[PDB]
Nucleic acid binder design. Structure first.
Ligand SMILES: [Mg+2]
Ligand SMILES: [Mg+2]
Lengths: 270, 269
DNA sequence: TCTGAAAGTACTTTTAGA
DNA sequence: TCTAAAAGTACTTTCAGA
């Protein structure tokens, strides 16, 4: 929490003097002042105990700890190259809000189970379109390095052909940020009718979306207008890296040897 | 710099007594002890002045600021939901850690100029390989919907062909997370010899090879071991979204008309 | 209850010795 | 130079008074 908001939240519970002491600290210039208790007491014409009491009601041990957070945020605000604009802050907000929204939707028992489904499957398949298609290509690169036999598909023709060759040892991961993409939903259903296990990634909850073996609910974008939203890959990439971390710990010793052999052949071929 | 390196960077010039104090605070478990001066004084058999002298040696006013800097970082370290597993915790930090670093690496006036560079450019190209290739394709999708004439390329055979058809009104953006990819660096130079403006995205700083119009510094992965690092697209994804935001407000109404036209005609009519 | 004033204290400064 | 101990202080705690 920004200290400007921390004083704001701890406002209506403060005494009249401290409510005025806050008003000085909410001022923008205040950071450039001498902020020692001796100076602040003379400038605001108060006692040093008043500063301690004001900091205590803000949730601090005393004025020394309060002024440290106040100065620490400013030094962290001044450690940047440029001072950021509302546009710069809005884009960073969408990343952090998605991180916190994803964090609220984390289903640990589901994620390991899906990671287990990848391990047990002989062949793993990735269906996506647009940005979701690029997400599918990312997981294909990441997991093939660990020894998973996998392929990625990105068009309707690719989905239909791959489904026709699936069996009970196949697994398909479907990506649909909107949750209503026609090619993703049908082909995943077509995969199920061939015995393949199916997992769907979406940001919308759907009652009939219980058809697939697993259904991972991902975060929704912070911006309301579509044109202003951040990268559409991010809602799934959070869960991509989670399932990857869980999947890596299953037979970690053997999987690392597969990774290092993959990395050796690539790096040494200069 | 975290509290770990400031003690690491501030070590060799410390006296023998304080160097023991350094390792005491550098050990992971010491966070849980009573970090008051007296308790630490009793544990280490030192003087309370020694703690103040040690803390000033780290660049602080005294022991009070050191502990608060020490304990606040742990408060920053464990303000997440304390229910998840260590696996879930590590991934969520690496996502945040990249965002913490990215915000500090932002050069707003540089990103604005790049956003202007794409608008003024008649043709824009995105070069990348592997994960960097996927980022290039992602950026191609976002800007094409706004009316930018662009193509994305992911192999060196594509890079060489494109460089032949480029001129002074072309602009190419190369993505190389390592900063030492031969195809990205060489083809970027071939673009400049054709008169086009060049922008390079890299996590390693390089003003030595300031041959490109702009060089954008992206965040580095929090995990030290390669196998455990999160998606490699994240350092690029932060800056492409920022550049997209600045570009969007340039002739916003006309950009929005094209964007709605894109979804109208390229979505089952 | 609430404020400043006085007494108290976790550290901070000064000091003397090795 | 370096340290602990002594001396000092920037707040912190205690507490009369309105
Ligand atoms: Mg003495
Ligand atoms: Mg004085």
């Amino acid at each position: 929490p920004d200290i400007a908001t921390v004083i704001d939240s701890h406002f209506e519970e403060m005494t009249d003097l401290e409510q005025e002491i806050a008003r000085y600290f909410l001022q923008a210039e205040t950071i450039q002042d001498d902020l020692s208790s001796q100076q602040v007491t003379q400038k605001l014409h108060i006692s040093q105990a008043a500063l301690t009491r004001f900091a205590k009601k803000c949730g601090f041990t005393g004025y020394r700890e309060f002024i440290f957070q106040y100065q620490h945020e400013a030094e962290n605000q001044a450690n940047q190259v440029s001072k950021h604009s509302p546009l710069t802050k809005r884009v960073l907000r969408s990343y952090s809000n998605m991180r916190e929204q994803t964090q609220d939707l984390i289903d640990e028992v589901q994620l390991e189970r899906i990671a287990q489904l990848i391990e047990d499957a002989e062949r793993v398949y990735f269906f996506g379109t647009g940005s979701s298609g690029l997400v599918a290509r990312e997981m294909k690169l990441r997991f093939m390095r660990l020894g998973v036999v996998c392929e990625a598909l990105t068009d309707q023709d690719g989905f239909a052909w791959t489904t026709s060759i699936m069996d009970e040892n196949c697994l398909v991961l479907g990506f649909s940020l909107s949750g209503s993409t026609p090619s993703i939903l049908d082909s995943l259903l077509d995969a199920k009718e061939m015995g393949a296990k199916t997992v769907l990634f979406s940001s919308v909850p759907n009652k009939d979306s219980q058809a697939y073996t697993e259904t991972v609910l991902v975060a929704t974008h912070s911006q309301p207008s579509y044109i202003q939203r951040i990268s559409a890959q991010l809602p799934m990439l959070f869960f991509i890296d989670l399932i990857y971390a869980y999947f890596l710990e299953i037979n970690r010793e053997s999987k690392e040897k597969i990774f290092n052999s993959y990395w050796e052949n690539k790096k040494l071929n200069g």
